[PDB]
Amino acid sequence: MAVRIQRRWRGFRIRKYCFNYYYLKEYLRAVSETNDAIREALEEFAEMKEREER
């Protein structure tokens, strides 16, 4: 039953202090997810460099 305490402790210790991968890959997917919502937003203004100067 102690083997049960150490498993969870050694898990979350790594997660919090050392590194967490459930903190990494979800965001690494958000990297490609956000690029779609980044682009047209100020492509409209990149083409409004046209609609204001060109």
Partner: protein
Amino acid sequence: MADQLTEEQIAEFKEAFSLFDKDGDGTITTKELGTVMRSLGQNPTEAELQDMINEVDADGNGTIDFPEFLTMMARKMKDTDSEEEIREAFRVFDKDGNGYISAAELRHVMTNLGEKLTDEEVDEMIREADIDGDGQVNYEEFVQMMTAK
């Protein structure tokens, strides 16, 4: 049986199989492997690491390749951390089982019973059970604290 995981699990646990691989045999060593585990939501024992290395290690040196990493990820899926049974682990060390343990009472266990933690891990799990971090194990805090992924 190097064909257990699914595509989502394969992708999620392959690039974490990586972050601590340094020996580089297409495999990973023991403690780097535990770190790979513990950063992947799940929290294995020091004993589960070896039980589930040795069964699938075709080499016997404690290094596990990614195809066998599939098997051991799937077994750790089967060993998904049961939330209530660590909380239960605390009511019998704290023989009263009220919810609160002193640092000394639980350290008397983490030094004599099970996979005896080093005192650094013991102190940090004091700080993580007692979020204040003074020496009073609140395991009804400790458990869902560790559930956080």
